[PDB]
Design an enzyme around this catalytic site. Structure first.
Site, PDB file in Angstrom:
ATOM      1  N   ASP A  43      29.576  32.262  40.113  1.00 61.58           N
ATOM      2  CA  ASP A  43      29.732  33.852  40.039  1.00 61.58           C
ATOM      3  C   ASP A  43      31.069  34.429  39.772  1.00 61.58           C
ATOM      4  O   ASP A  43      31.951  34.092  40.780  1.00 61.58           O
ATOM      5  CB  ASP A  43      28.847  34.472  41.373  1.00 61.58           C
ATOM      6  CG  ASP A  43      28.673  35.974  40.832  1.00 61.58           C
ATOM      7  OD1 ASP A  43      27.524  36.566  39.873  1.00 61.58           O
ATOM      8  OD2 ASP A  43      29.429  36.863  41.063  1.00 61.58           O
ATOM      9  N   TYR A  48      37.048  40.498  38.481  1.00 61.17           N
ATOM     10  CA  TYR A  48      37.759  39.692  39.332  1.00 61.17           C
ATOM     11  C   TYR A  48      39.138  39.202  38.691  1.00 61.17           C
ATOM     12  O   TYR A  48      39.717  38.808  39.705  1.00 61.17           O
ATOM     13  CB  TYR A  48      37.027  38.404  39.767  1.00 61.17           C
ATOM     14  CG  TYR A  48      35.413  38.839  40.281  1.00 61.17           C
ATOM     15  CD1 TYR A  48      35.390  40.159  40.819  1.00 61.17           C
ATOM     16  CD2 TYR A  48      34.336  37.884  40.247  1.00 61.17           C
ATOM     17  CE1 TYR A  48      34.159  40.427  41.386  1.00 61.17           C
ATOM     18  CE2 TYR A  48      33.223  38.079  40.686  1.00 61.17           C
ATOM     19  CZ  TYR A  48      33.108  39.537  41.170  1.00 61.17           C
ATOM     20  OH  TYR A  48      31.805  39.852  41.748  1.00 61.17           O
ATOM     21  N   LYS A  77      30.119  39.516  34.188  1.00 63.36           N
ATOM     22  CA  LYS A  77      29.617  40.917  34.400  1.00 63.36           C
ATOM     23  C   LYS A  77      30.506  41.613  33.702  1.00 63.36           C
ATOM     24  O   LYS A  77      31.670  41.748  33.546  1.00 63.36           O
ATOM     25  CB  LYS A  77      29.685  41.302  35.932  1.00 63.36           C
ATOM     26  CG  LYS A  77      29.282  40.199  36.781  1.00 63.36           C
ATOM     27  CD  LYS A  77      28.887  40.770  38.330  1.00 63.36           C
ATOM     28  CE  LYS A  77      28.577  39.634  39.188  1.00 63.36           C
ATOM     29  NZ  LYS A  77      30.030  39.000  39.674  1.00 63.36           N
ATOM     30  N   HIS A 110      27.537  45.059  35.714  1.00 61.77           N
ATOM     31  CA  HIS A 110      28.074  45.009  37.062  1.00 61.77           C
ATOM     32  C   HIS A 110      27.685  46.019  37.877  1.00 61.77           C
ATOM     33  O   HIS A 110      27.506  45.728  39.216  1.00 61.77           O
ATOM     34  CB  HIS A 110      29.665  44.870  37.116  1.00 61.77           C
ATOM     35  CG  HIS A 110      30.322  44.281  38.435  1.00 61.77           C
ATOM     36  ND1 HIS A 110      31.732  43.739  38.152  1.00 61.77           N
ATOM     37  CD2 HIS A 110      29.758  44.178  39.523  1.00 61.77           C
ATOM     38  CE1 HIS A 110      31.800  43.047  39.180  1.00 61.77           C
ATOM     39  NE2 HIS A 110      31.046  43.703  40.436  1.00 61.77           N
ATOM     40  N   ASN A 160      23.636  45.695  41.473  1.00 58.38           N
ATOM     41  CA  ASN A 160      23.716  47.086  42.087  1.00 58.38           C
ATOM     42  C   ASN A 160      22.861  48.356  41.840  1.00 58.38           C
ATOM     43  O   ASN A 160      23.016  49.409  42.001  1.00 58.38           O
ATOM     44  CB  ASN A 160      25.361  47.647  42.138  1.00 58.38           C
ATOM     45  CG  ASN A 160      26.112  46.687  42.594  1.00 58.38           C
ATOM     46  OD1 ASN A 160      27.334  46.204  42.156  1.00 58.38           O
ATOM     47  ND2 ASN A 160      26.010  46.180  44.086  1.00 58.38           N
ATOM     48  N   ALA A 211      26.436  37.814  51.438  1.00 59.96           N
ATOM     49  CA  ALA A 211      25.294  37.321  52.454  1.00 59.96           C
ATOM     50  C   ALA A 211      25.969  36.811  53.502  1.00 59.96           C
ATOM     51  O   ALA A 211      25.299  36.642  54.557  1.00 59.96           O
ATOM     52  CB  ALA A 211      24.655  36.162  51.515  1.00 59.96           C
TER      53      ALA A 211
HETATM   54  N1  NAP Z   1      28.039  42.254  41.939  1.00 60.00           N
HETATM   55  C1  NAP Z   1      28.786  42.920  42.814  1.00 60.00           C
HETATM   56  O1  NAP Z   1      29.032  44.378  43.063  1.00 60.00           O
HETATM   57  C2  NAP Z   1      29.424  42.023  43.819  1.00 60.00           C
HETATM   58  C3  NAP Z   1      29.918  42.510  45.081  1.00 60.00           C
HETATM   59  C4  NAP Z   1      30.611  41.604  46.121  1.00 60.00           C
HETATM   60  C5  NAP Z   1      30.635  40.357  45.913  1.00 60.00           C
HETATM   61  N2  NAP Z   1      30.251  39.687  44.552  1.00 60.00           N
HETATM   62  C6  NAP Z   1      29.926  38.468  44.611  1.00 60.00           C
HETATM   63  O2  NAP Z   1      29.430  37.913  45.470  1.00 60.00           O
HETATM   64  C7  NAP Z   1      30.567  36.703  46.172  1.00 60.00           C
HETATM   65  C8  NAP Z   1      30.279  36.606  47.494  1.00 60.00           C
HETATM   66  O3  NAP Z   1      30.270  37.931  48.155  1.00 60.00           O
HETATM   67  P1  NAP Z   1      31.404  38.335  49.427  1.00 60.00           P
HETATM   68  O4  NAP Z   1      32.744  38.105  48.666  1.00 60.00           O
HETATM   69  O5  NAP Z   1      31.253  39.750  49.691  1.00 60.00           O
HETATM   70  O6  NAP Z   1      31.532  37.519  50.439  1.00 60.00           O
HETATM   71  P2  NAP Z   1      30.737  36.586  51.203  1.00 60.00           P
HETATM   72  O7  NAP Z   1      29.884  35.279  50.413  1.00 60.00           O
HETATM   73  O8  NAP Z   1      29.691  37.486  52.308  1.00 60.00           O
HETATM   74  O9  NAP Z   1      31.842  35.837  52.237  1.00 60.00           O
HETATM   75  C9  NAP Z   1      32.312  36.400  53.344  1.00 60.00           C
HETATM   76  C10 NAP Z   1      33.527  35.653  53.986  1.00 60.00           C
HETATM   77  O10 NAP Z   1      32.729  34.442  54.603  1.00 60.00           O
HETATM   78  C11 NAP Z   1      33.545  33.435  54.853  1.00 60.00           C
HETATM   79  N3  NAP Z   1      32.687  32.147  54.980  1.00 60.00           N
HETATM   80  C12 NAP Z   1      32.075  31.470  53.891  1.00 60.00           C
HETATM   81  N4  NAP Z   1      31.506  30.395  54.627  1.00 60.00           N
HETATM   82  C13 NAP Z   1      31.779  30.485  55.810  1.00 60.00           C
HETATM   83  C14 NAP Z   1      31.222  29.739  56.565  1.00 60.00           C
HETATM   84  N5  NAP Z   1      30.422  28.738  56.390  1.00 60.00           N
HETATM   85  N6  NAP Z   1      31.351  29.855  57.982  1.00 60.00           N
HETATM   86  C15 NAP Z   1      32.185  31.211  58.229  1.00 60.00           C
HETATM   87  N7  NAP Z   1      32.741  32.025  57.140  1.00 60.00           N
HETATM   88  C16 NAP Z   1      32.445  31.618  55.983  1.00 60.00           C
HETATM   89  C17 NAP Z   1      34.623  33.494  53.679  1.00 60.00           C
HETATM   90  O11 NAP Z   1      35.942  33.435  54.096  1.00 60.00           O
HETATM   91  P3  NAP Z   1      36.743  31.897  53.724  1.00 60.00           P
HETATM   92  O12 NAP Z   1      37.038  32.314  52.283  1.00 60.00           O
HETATM   93  O13 NAP Z   1      37.905  32.168  54.587  1.00 60.00           O
HETATM   94  O14 NAP Z   1      35.909  30.882  53.996  1.00 60.00           O
HETATM   95  C18 NAP Z   1      34.304  34.849  52.884  1.00 60.00           C
HETATM   96  O15 NAP Z   1      35.566  35.603  52.682  1.00 60.00           O
HETATM   97  C19 NAP Z   1      31.559  37.457  45.644  1.00 60.00           C
HETATM   98  O16 NAP Z   1      32.820  36.317  45.685  1.00 60.00           O
HETATM   99  C20 NAP Z   1      31.161  37.614  44.151  1.00 60.00           C
HETATM  100  O17 NAP Z   1      31.246  36.588  43.257  1.00 60.00           O
HETATM  101  C21 NAP Z   1      29.403  40.678  43.817  1.00 60.00           C
HETATM  102  C1  ASD Z   2      34.037  47.024  44.871  1.00 59.31           C
HETATM  103  C2  ASD Z   2      34.202  48.053  43.998  1.00 59.31           C
HETATM  104  C3  ASD Z   2      34.725  47.614  42.706  1.00 59.31           C
HETATM  105  C4  ASD Z   2      36.217  48.170  42.325  1.00 59.31           C
HETATM  106  C5  ASD Z   2      36.903  49.366  43.339  1.00 59.31           C
HETATM  107  O1  ASD Z   2      37.947  49.780  43.145  1.00 59.31           O
HETATM  108  C6  ASD Z   2      36.092  49.801  44.503  1.00 59.31           C
HETATM  109  C7  ASD Z   2      34.808  49.284  44.913  1.00 59.31           C
HETATM  110  C8  ASD Z   2      34.132  49.761  46.160  1.00 59.31           C
HETATM  111  C9  ASD Z   2      32.597  50.271  46.051  1.00 59.31           C
HETATM  112  C10 ASD Z   2      31.931  48.931  45.090  1.00 59.31           C
HETATM  113  C11 ASD Z   2      32.671  48.806  43.692  1.00 59.31           C
HETATM  114  C12 ASD Z   2      31.608  47.846  43.105  1.00 59.31           C
HETATM  115  C13 ASD Z   2      30.269  48.585  42.886  1.00 59.31           C
HETATM  116  C14 ASD Z   2      29.688  48.652  43.970  1.00 59.31           C
HETATM  117  C15 ASD Z   2      29.339  47.385  44.763  1.00 59.31           C
HETATM  118  C16 ASD Z   2      28.173  49.323  44.146  1.00 59.31           C
HETATM  119  O2  ASD Z   2      27.298  49.610  43.237  1.00 59.31           O
HETATM  120  C17 ASD Z   2      28.104  50.166  45.490  1.00 59.31           C
HETATM  121  C18 ASD Z   2      29.347  49.760  46.351  1.00 59.31           C
HETATM  122  C19 ASD Z   2      30.272  49.694  44.826  1.00 59.31           C
END
Ligand code: NAP
Ligand code: ASD
Length: 316
Positions: A43, A48, A77, A110, A160, A211
């Site tokens: 993803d 990013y 995205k 996105h 979202n 997650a």
């Molecule tokens: N669509 C959107 O608006 C949106 C928004 C947020 C995120 N995303 C996507 O979802 C992905 C994941 O979301 P997220 O970045 O919020 O992170 P996340 O998957 O909730 O991860 C949080 C932290 O957990 C740690 N971690 C991973 N495995 C672990 C384990 N087994 N034990 C303990 N800690 C662990 C990682 O730190 P370490 O790196 O130190 O292991 C990571 O920084 C993003 O990279 C992106 O691809 C999309």
């Molecule tokens: C990560 C982000 C991107 C760039 C930036 O400058 C600030 C933010 C914070 C809020 C995020 C947004 C991505 C869009 C999000 C995930 C939603 O749909 C609700 C919260 C909002």
């Protein structure tokens, strides 16, 4: 390998690798580690600024014979400053050019929060509020449909969106393709059960990000917020199963029919996360995790909460 069938006949692996980390390459290294560990769903996003490096990692693991292209499920995205219909294909083509791939497996809107076009990722006013745009999201979606028909994206979906915002797309006159998925913040402190039931009723897959509780970026996370993986129920479940609280959180999503992303930039944690397939939470474990819901979104900043189409205004 374990995959769900999308409403367009394509298949998506139920475990995905999150490539995003704070601006502080490494993306290249850890994406190859992820594929080496067994991740097949990767993803990324324009947001990013890592698509060259993630694309490189994927192509590198195909070129060295580890995987074939059809074995990788690659997501990018469309960023919220590119919602105007005429910007959408060029934004996809630019994503593809960066990754050096012919097509993405999945291309997402996105966010439902359109932003004014330009070179800034989040144009903001003097009051810290994003400068928003009024583009009709249905026209953005029609342009996404054309990207699918051009073969540039195998599947298309959203991210979202709340129920209302999904219904706008679903109820569009002349709708050709439903979103295959809605990628949303989802974890035991914000389980989205109502939105998940709605998505299932519509044959839309819910894909969970944050997650593992998010990376808690100081730019948008409330530092007051509890650390998910410190949750005592999650830690008790981890001890019971001889796993980790991270595994308990990922497995929870798998058992409720949620496709789950996991970001890690750490080689040992990357390898650990693929262990989610090795164990099963009981009916009572799942009910206990369900009870943790606090409706807590970690992305929690005025900059976007001010936006008229902020998805968290609605009940779900
Ligand atoms: N669509 C959107 O608006 C949106 C928004 C947020 C995120 N995303 C996507 O979802 C992905 C994941 O979301 P997220 O970045 O919020 O992170 P996340 O998957 O909730 O991860 C949080 C932290 O957990 C740690 N971690 C991973 N495995 C672990 C384990 N087994 N034990 C303990 N800690 C662990 C990682 O730190 P370490 O790196 O130190 O292991 C990571 O920084 C993003 O990279 C992106 O691809 C999309
Ligand atoms: C990560 C982000 C991107 C760039 C930036 O400058 C600030 C933010 C914070 C809020 C995020 C947004 C991505 C869009 C999000 C995930 C939603 O749909 C609700 C919260 C909002």
């Amino acid at each position: 390998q374990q995959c769900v069938k999308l409403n367009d006949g394509h298949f998506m692996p139920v475990l995905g690798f999150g490539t995003y980390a704070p601006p502080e390459s490494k993306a290249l290294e850890v994406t190859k580690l992820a594929i080496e560990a067994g991740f097949r769903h990767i993803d990324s996003a324009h947001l990013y600024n890592n698509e060259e490096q993630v694309g490189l990692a994927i192509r590198s693991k195909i070129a060295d014979g580890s995987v074939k292209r059809e074995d990788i499920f690659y997501t990018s995205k469309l960023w919220s400053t590119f919602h105007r219909p005429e910007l959408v294909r060029p934004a996809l083509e630019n994503s593809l050019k960066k990754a050096q791939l012919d097509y993405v497996d999945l291309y997402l809107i996105h966010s439902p929060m359109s932003l004014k076009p330009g070179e800034e990722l989040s144009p903001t006013d003097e009051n810290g509020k994003v400068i928003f745009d009024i583009v009709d999201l249905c026209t953005t979606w029609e342009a996404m449909e054309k990207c699918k028909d051009a073969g540039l994206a195998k599947s298309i979906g959203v991210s979202n969106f709340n129920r209302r915002q999904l219904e706008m797309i679903l109820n569009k006159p002349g709708l050709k393709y439903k979103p295959v998925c809605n990628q949303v913040e989802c974890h035991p402190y914000f389980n989205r059960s109502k939105l998940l039931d709605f998505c299932k009723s519509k044959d839309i897959v819910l894909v969970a990000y944050s997650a593992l509780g998010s990376q808690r970026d100081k730019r948008w996370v409330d530092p007051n917020s509890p650390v998910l993986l410190e949750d005592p129920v999650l830690c008790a479940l981890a001890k019971k199963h001889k796993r980790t609280p991270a595994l308990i959180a990922l497995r929870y999503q798998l058992q409720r029919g949620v496709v789950v992303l996991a970001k890690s930039y750490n080689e040992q944690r990357i390898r650990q996360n693929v262990q989610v397939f090795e164990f099963q939470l009981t009916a009572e474990d799942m009910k206990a995790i369900d009870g943790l819901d606090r409706n807590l979104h970690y992305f929690n900043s005025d900059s976007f909460a001010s936006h008229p189409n902020y998805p968290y205004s609605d009940e779900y």
